[PDB]
Design a protein around this motif. Structure first.
Motif, PDB file in Angstrom:
ATOM      1  N   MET A 239      53.658  18.258  29.376  1.00  0.00           N
ATOM      2  CA  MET A 239      53.234  19.627  29.643  1.00  0.00           C
ATOM      3  C   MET A 239      51.750  19.807  29.337  1.00  0.00           C
ATOM      4  SD  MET A 239      56.528  21.458  27.879  1.00  0.00           S
ATOM      5  CE  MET A 239      57.345  20.133  26.993  1.00  0.00           C
ATOM      6  N   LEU A 240      51.038  20.463  30.246  1.00  0.00           N
ATOM      7  CA  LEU A 240      49.609  20.701  30.073  1.00  0.00           C
ATOM      8  C   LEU A 240      49.354  22.101  29.525  1.00  0.00           C
ATOM      9  CD1 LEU A 240      46.944  19.171  30.554  1.00  0.00           C
ATOM     10  CD2 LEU A 240      46.745  20.411  32.717  1.00  0.00           C
ATOM     11  N   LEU A 241      48.349  22.220  28.664  1.00  0.00           N
ATOM     12  CA  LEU A 241      47.998  23.505  28.069  1.00  0.00           C
ATOM     13  C   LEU A 241      46.763  24.097  28.739  1.00  0.00           C
ATOM     14  CD1 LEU A 241      48.812  25.452  25.727  1.00  0.00           C
ATOM     15  CD2 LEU A 241      47.033  24.326  24.377  1.00  0.00           C
ATOM     16  N   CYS A 242      46.896  25.322  29.238  1.00  0.00           N
ATOM     17  CA  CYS A 242      45.792  26.002  29.902  1.00  0.00           C
ATOM     18  C   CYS A 242      45.852  27.506  29.656  1.00  0.00           C
ATOM     19  CB  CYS A 242      45.821  25.720  31.405  1.00  0.00           C
ATOM     20  SG  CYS A 242      45.665  23.956  31.834  1.00  0.00           S
ATOM     21  N   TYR A 243      44.697  28.160  29.733  1.00  0.00           N
ATOM     22  CA  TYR A 243      44.618  29.599  29.515  1.00  0.00           C
ATOM     23  C   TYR A 243      45.389  30.356  30.593  1.00  0.00           C
ATOM     24  CZ  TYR A 243      41.022  28.885  25.967  1.00  0.00           C
ATOM     25  OH  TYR A 243      40.337  28.510  24.834  1.00  0.00           O
ATOM     26  N   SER A 244      45.594  31.650  30.366  1.00  0.00           N
ATOM     27  CA  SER A 244      46.320  32.487  31.314  1.00  0.00           C
ATOM     28  C   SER A 244      45.795  33.920  31.287  1.00  0.00           C
ATOM     29  CB  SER A 244      47.816  32.474  30.998  1.00  0.00           C
ATOM     30  OG  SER A 244      48.467  33.597  31.566  1.00  0.00           O
ATOM     31  N   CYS A 245      44.944  34.250  32.252  1.00  0.00           N
ATOM     32  CA  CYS A 245      44.368  35.586  32.340  1.00  0.00           C
ATOM     33  C   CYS A 245      44.205  36.013  33.796  1.00  0.00           C
ATOM     34  CB  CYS A 245      43.014  35.630  31.631  1.00  0.00           C
ATOM     35  SG  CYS A 245      42.886  34.503  30.205  1.00  0.00           S
ATOM     36  N   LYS A 246      45.112  36.866  34.263  1.00  0.00           N
ATOM     37  CA  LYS A 246      45.069  37.354  35.636  1.00  0.00           C
ATOM     38  C   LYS A 246      44.464  38.753  35.698  1.00  0.00           C
ATOM     39  CE  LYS A 246      48.600  38.035  33.169  1.00  0.00           C
ATOM     40  NZ  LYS A 246      47.420  38.339  32.313  1.00  0.00           N
ATOM     41  N   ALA A 247      43.668  39.003  36.733  1.00  0.00           N
ATOM     42  CA  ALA A 247      43.032  40.302  36.910  1.00  0.00           C
ATOM     43  C   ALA A 247      42.321  40.743  35.635  1.00  0.00           C
ATOM     44  CB  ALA A 247      44.060  41.342  37.330  1.00  0.00           C
ATOM     45  N   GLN A 248      41.522  39.845  35.067  1.00  0.00           N
ATOM     46  CA  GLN A 248      40.787  40.143  33.844  1.00  0.00           C
ATOM     47  C   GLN A 248      39.282  40.086  34.086  1.00  0.00           C
ATOM     48  OE1 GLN A 248      43.195  38.523  29.943  1.00  0.00           O
ATOM     49  NE2 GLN A 248      41.118  39.364  29.802  1.00  0.00           N
TER      50      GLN A 248
ATOM     51  N   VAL B  88      46.104  31.267  25.408  1.00  0.00           N
ATOM     52  CA  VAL B  88      46.451  29.917  25.840  1.00  0.00           C
ATOM     53  C   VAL B  88      47.963  29.727  25.885  1.00  0.00           C
ATOM     54  CG1 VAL B  88      45.787  27.502  25.599  1.00  0.00           C
ATOM     55  CG2 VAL B  88      44.454  29.284  24.448  1.00  0.00           C
ATOM     56  N   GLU B  89      48.465  29.285  27.034  1.00  0.00           N
ATOM     57  CA  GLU B  89      49.894  29.062  27.208  1.00  0.00           C
ATOM     58  C   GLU B  89      50.162  27.683  27.805  1.00  0.00           C
ATOM     59  OE1 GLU B  89      54.106  29.942  27.441  1.00  0.00           O
ATOM     60  OE2 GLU B  89      52.378  30.438  26.177  1.00  0.00           O
ATOM     61  N   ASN B  90      51.261  27.066  27.383  1.00  0.00           N
ATOM     62  CA  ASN B  90      51.631  25.743  27.875  1.00  0.00           C
ATOM     63  C   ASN B  90      52.378  25.844  29.201  1.00  0.00           C
ATOM     64  OD1 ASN B  90      54.619  26.109  27.004  1.00  0.00           O
ATOM     65  ND2 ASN B  90      53.467  26.379  25.095  1.00  0.00           N
TER      66      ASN B  90
ATOM     67  N   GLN C 235      48.849  21.003  37.699  1.00  0.00           N
ATOM     68  CA  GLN C 235      47.414  21.114  37.467  1.00  0.00           C
ATOM     69  C   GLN C 235      46.997  22.574  37.317  1.00  0.00           C
ATOM     70  OE1 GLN C 235      48.814  19.775  40.176  1.00  0.00           O
ATOM     71  NE2 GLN C 235      48.348  17.579  40.242  1.00  0.00           N
ATOM     72  N   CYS C 236      45.907  22.801  36.594  1.00  0.00           N
ATOM     73  CA  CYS C 236      45.403  24.151  36.374  1.00  0.00           C
ATOM     74  C   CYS C 236      44.157  24.412  37.215  1.00  0.00           C
ATOM     75  CB  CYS C 236      45.085  24.364  34.892  1.00  0.00           C
ATOM     76  SG  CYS C 236      46.505  24.103  33.781  1.00  0.00           S
ATOM     77  N   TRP C 237      43.910  25.680  37.519  1.00  0.00           N
ATOM     78  CA  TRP C 237      42.750  26.063  38.317  1.00  0.00           C
ATOM     79  C   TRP C 237      42.188  27.402  37.854  1.00  0.00           C
ATOM     80  CZ3 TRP C 237      43.235  30.800  39.987  1.00  0.00           C
ATOM     81  CH2 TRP C 237      44.506  31.302  40.301  1.00  0.00           C
TER      82      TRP C 237
ATOM     83  N   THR D  72      38.939  26.669  41.537  1.00  0.00           N
ATOM     84  CA  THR D  72      38.546  25.316  41.165  1.00  0.00           C
ATOM     85  C   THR D  72      39.663  24.608  40.409  1.00  0.00           C
ATOM     86  OG1 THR D  72      37.559  25.905  39.017  1.00  0.00           O
ATOM     87  CG2 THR D  72      36.156  26.096  40.973  1.00  0.00           C
ATOM     88  N   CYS D  73      40.141  23.502  40.969  1.00  0.00           N
ATOM     89  CA  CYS D  73      41.211  22.729  40.348  1.00  0.00           C
ATOM     90  C   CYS D  73      40.668  21.860  39.218  1.00  0.00           C
ATOM     91  CB  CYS D  73      41.907  21.853  41.391  1.00  0.00           C
ATOM     92  SG  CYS D  73      43.537  21.229  40.869  1.00  0.00           S
ATOM     93  N   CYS D  74      41.554  21.449  38.317  1.00  0.00           N
ATOM     94  CA  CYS D  74      41.166  20.613  37.187  1.00  0.00           C
ATOM     95  C   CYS D  74      42.396  20.059  36.473  1.00  0.00           C
ATOM     96  CB  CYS D  74      40.309  21.414  36.205  1.00  0.00           C
ATOM     97  SG  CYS D  74      40.917  23.102  35.893  1.00  0.00           S
ATOM     98  N   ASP D  75      42.294  18.817  36.010  1.00  0.00           N
ATOM     99  CA  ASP D  75      43.397  18.172  35.307  1.00  0.00           C
ATOM    100  C   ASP D  75      43.024  17.890  33.855  1.00  0.00           C
ATOM    101  OD1 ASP D  75      42.343  15.069  35.424  1.00  0.00           O
ATOM    102  OD2 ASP D  75      41.903  16.159  37.281  1.00  0.00           O
ATOM    103  N   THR D  76      42.496  18.904  33.177  1.00  0.00           N
ATOM    104  CA  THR D  76      42.095  18.765  31.783  1.00  0.00           C
ATOM    105  C   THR D  76      42.677  19.886  30.930  1.00  0.00           C
ATOM    106  OG1 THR D  76      39.969  19.541  32.685  1.00  0.00           O
ATOM    107  CG2 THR D  76      40.013  17.347  31.675  1.00  0.00           C
ATOM    108  N   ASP D  77      42.941  19.583  29.664  1.00  0.00           N
ATOM    109  CA  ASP D  77      43.499  20.566  28.743  1.00  0.00           C
ATOM    110  C   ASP D  77      42.543  21.742  28.559  1.00  0.00           C
ATOM    111  OD1 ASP D  77      46.054  20.643  27.211  1.00  0.00           O
ATOM    112  OD2 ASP D  77      44.707  21.090  25.532  1.00  0.00           O
ATOM    113  N   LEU D  78      43.038  22.946  28.823  1.00  0.00           N
ATOM    114  CA  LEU D  78      42.228  24.153  28.689  1.00  0.00           C
ATOM    115  C   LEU D  78      40.993  24.081  29.581  1.00  0.00           C
ATOM    116  CD1 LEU D  78      44.164  24.299  26.379  1.00  0.00           C
ATOM    117  CD2 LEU D  78      42.316  25.094  24.893  1.00  0.00           C
ATOM    118  N   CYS D  79      41.146  23.458  30.745  1.00  0.00           N
ATOM    119  CA  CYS D  79      40.044  23.323  31.691  1.00  0.00           C
ATOM    120  C   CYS D  79      39.579  24.690  32.183  1.00  0.00           C
ATOM    121  CB  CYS D  79      40.469  22.459  32.880  1.00  0.00           C
ATOM    122  SG  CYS D  79      41.599  23.293  34.040  1.00  0.00           S
ATOM    123  N   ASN D  80      40.492  25.655  32.183  1.00  0.00           N
ATOM    124  CA  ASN D  80      40.175  27.007  32.629  1.00  0.00           C
ATOM    125  C   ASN D  80      39.778  27.891  31.450  1.00  0.00           C
ATOM    126  OD1 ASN D  80      42.524  27.547  31.262  1.00  0.00           O
ATOM    127  ND2 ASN D  80      43.756  27.948  33.095  1.00  0.00           N
TER     128      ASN D  80
END
Length: 76
Positions: free
Chosen positions: A1-10, A19-21, A28-30, A66-74
């Protein structure tokens, strides 16, 4: 499981610190950036398998994903 931020319409980065897993590994995260003629600016992010390395054919103009395959890339 990858960990990335989560903020829509912010628009406030200070608030964009949740940050949510993801669900399962492989996804992948973007990060999307919205900047209209004015000054207001929104920020969005997602997590799924369908994440083109570079969105040129679509998702352009005002909102660029923008796509990215890194932890907390966003993070930014």
């Amino acid at each position: 499981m990858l960990l990335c931020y989560s903020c829509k319409a912010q628009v406030s980065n200070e608030d964009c610190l949740q940050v949510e897993n993801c669900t399962q590994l492989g996804e992948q995260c973007w990060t999307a950036r919205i900047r209209a003629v004015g000054l207001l600016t929104v920020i969005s992010k997602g997590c799924s398998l369908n994440c083109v390395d570079d969105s040129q054919d679509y998702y352009v103009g005002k909102k660029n994903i923008t796509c990215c395959d890194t932890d907390l890339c966003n993070a930014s």
